[PDB]
Amino acid sequence: MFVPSYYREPHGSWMAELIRGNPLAMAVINGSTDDGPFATHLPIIPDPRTTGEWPDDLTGANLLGHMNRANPQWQELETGKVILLAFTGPHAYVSPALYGVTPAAPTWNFTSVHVRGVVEKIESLEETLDVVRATAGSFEARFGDDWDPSDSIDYFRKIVPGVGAFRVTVTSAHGMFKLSQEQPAEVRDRVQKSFSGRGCSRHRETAELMGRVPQTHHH
Amino acid sequence: MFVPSYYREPHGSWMAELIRGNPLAMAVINGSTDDGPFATHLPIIPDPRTTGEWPDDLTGANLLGHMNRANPQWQELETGKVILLAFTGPHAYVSPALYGVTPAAPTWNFTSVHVRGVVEKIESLEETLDVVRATAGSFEARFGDDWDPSDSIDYFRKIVPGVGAFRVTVTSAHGMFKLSQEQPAEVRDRVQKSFSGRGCSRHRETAELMGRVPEHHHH
Numbered sequence: 449m450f451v452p453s454y455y456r457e458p459h460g461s462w463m464a465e466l467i468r469g470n471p472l473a474m475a476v477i478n479g480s481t482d483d484g485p486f487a488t489h490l491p492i493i494p495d496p497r498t499t500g501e502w503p504d505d506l507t508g509a510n511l512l513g514h515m516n517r518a519n520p521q522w523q524e525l526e527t528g529k530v531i532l533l534a535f536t537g538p539h540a541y542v543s544p545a546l547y548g549v550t551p552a553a554p555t556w557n558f559t560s561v562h563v564r565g566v567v568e569k570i571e572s573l574e575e576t577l578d579v580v581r582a583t584a585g586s587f588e589a590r591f592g593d594d595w596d597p598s599d600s601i602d603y604f605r606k607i608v609p610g611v612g613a614f615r616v617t618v619t620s621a622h623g624m625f626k627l628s629q630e631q632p633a634e635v636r637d638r639v640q641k642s643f644s645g646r647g648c649s650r651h652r653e654t655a656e657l658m659g660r661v662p663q664t665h666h667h
Numbered sequence: 668m669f670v671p672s673y674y675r676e677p678h679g680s681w682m683a684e685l686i687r688g689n690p691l692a693m694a695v696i697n698g699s700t701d702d703g704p705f706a707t708h709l710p711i712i713p714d715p716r717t718t719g720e721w722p723d724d725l726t727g728a729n730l731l732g733h734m735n736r737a738n739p740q741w742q743e744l745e746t747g748k749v750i751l752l753a754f755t756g757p758h759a760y761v762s763p764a765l766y767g768v769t770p771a772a773p774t775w776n777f778t779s780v781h782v783r784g785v786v787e788k789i790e791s792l793e794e795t796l797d798v799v800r801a802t803a804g805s806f807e808a809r810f811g812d813d814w815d816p817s818d819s820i821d822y823f824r825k826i827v828p829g830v831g832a833f834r835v836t837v838t839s840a841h842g843m844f845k846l847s848q849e850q851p852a853e854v855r856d857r858v859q860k861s862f863s864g865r866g867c868s869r870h871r872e873t874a875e876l877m878g879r880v881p882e883h884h885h886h
């Protein structure tokens with residue numbers, strides 16, 4: 449991932465936070481020269497084993513995902529293949545009108561974590577079930593409404609033969625936190641102020657992240 | 668793009684619409700077997716000279732983008748290479764507690780357009796400057812606050828040698844509009860109703876899309 453130094457994650461935990469808050473990744477592997485790469489949007493969770501052995505920069509951590517086994521990308525997920533998982537968080541277009549500075553150019557503030565690693569296909573029926581149930585339980589607790597899977601565990605087992613589950617061992621993770629760090633403090637405050645007053649949560653989230661980046665040229 | 672039949676764009680114009688509102692694409696090309704694919708977030712516009720604005724049918728359309736020429740992906744972007752541009756729109760986790768049905772599994776409603784095409788590198792500095800000026804002007808009208816670049820056109824010339832601009836001639840465009848179409852009408856209404864009341868606009872945006880649609884995912 450190409451990241452100018454002033455847009456790198458302010459601390460490694462920001463990557464963890466973004467991955468956990470936006471776990472529907474784009475999973476990308478090389479394809480043929482004529483087809484281009486494969487890409488599938490699919491849910492990713494940290495492997496619960498990694499919680500007790502957490503690496504600061506996520507290197508060597510294990511993530512889990514699944515996809516449809518009818519999806520052509522599944523046939524290509526050979527164990528040992530390199531994979532990219534791209535997670536995106538809040539973002540918003542920045543009008544130069546908020547800068548109060550001339551000259552200037554517009555830009556887009558945005559947040560992204562690119563994780564690279566090696567795929568291992570999961571074939572076991574029980575381990576596949578462990579993946580989808582841990583994904584269901586983690587997402588429901590974080591984003592849901594106290595739904596109880598207990599009456600649907602047998603339902604999961606009925607449909608689990610269709611699941612293509614896989615593990616990613618992380619070889620690198622990098623954050624792009626493009627939040628006006630190139631601008632003077634007075635200029636970032638003006639954008640952040642304008643973004644807070646929008647009321648559209650995505651703008652508010654972007655403003656909150658820009659406020660937590662310490663004082664550190666793009667465009 | 669792998670898309671179950673019931674999640675495909677109901678009309679080609681939905682894809683243009685999504686790209687229009689979320690033009691910061693993830694631009695992806697193949698890499699080496701050891702590196703994995705290249706991926707860069709960058710802004711995409713229709714070529715004003717040809718396509719001009721967004722058409723229902725994107726096949727054969729000409730798009731333009733740019734990235735930093737110092738970005739390793741620029742070196743690998745040979746003219747004639749295939750590229751993927753992935754655009755994402757609104758999305759939201761769906762708790763089964765909204766279904767009122769047992770058993771069930773959770774899911775994530777989301778929207779995505781994958782555009783594939785053939786790359787042509789732009790080398791003229793004036794044409795490169797044309798690309799970024801058209802991008803800034805288009806985005807400012809759509810997302811900004813009436814900022815006038817006139818006093819910054821000389822600033823653009825100063826920094827434009829760093830711009831790697833490129834054209835994509837589109838060979839295919841496919842939409843993933845995952846909006847609970849696998850669920851019965853009463854269930855879709857109930858999820859959509861809940862998304863309207865959340866107050867996070869991303870949820871409202873997802874609800875508005877579910878309302879526009881008149882199947883065995885997780886079934």
Ligand code: HEM
Nearest residue numbers: 491515516519580583584604608610611773774775884885
């Ligand atoms: C909890 C959050 C979950 C999310 C967000 C989620 C999301 C998804 C997505 C987006 C796909 C399509 C992948 C592709 O395009 O290749 C998929 C596939 C699939 N998932 Fe999940 N899933 C979740 C949990 C579960 C659970 C608990 C099960 C139970 C076994 C399950 C079973 C399946 C199956 C069978 C498929 C492939 C066939 C189909 O789409 O029905 N998933 N999932």
Ligand code: HEM
Nearest residue numbers: 554555556666667710734735738799803806823827829830
């Ligand atoms: C709304 C309008 C624009 C947006 C959203 C935008 C966005 C971006 C992004 C995301 C990158 C990073 C690409 C990478 O990671 O490799 C970039 C690079 C660049 N953009 Fe633009 N751009 C816009 C307009 C312009 C204009 C008008 C110019 C004037 C020349 C310009 C000059 C550059 C340059 C020189 C770079 C490479 C070096 C750097 O990032 O500072 N951009 N732009």
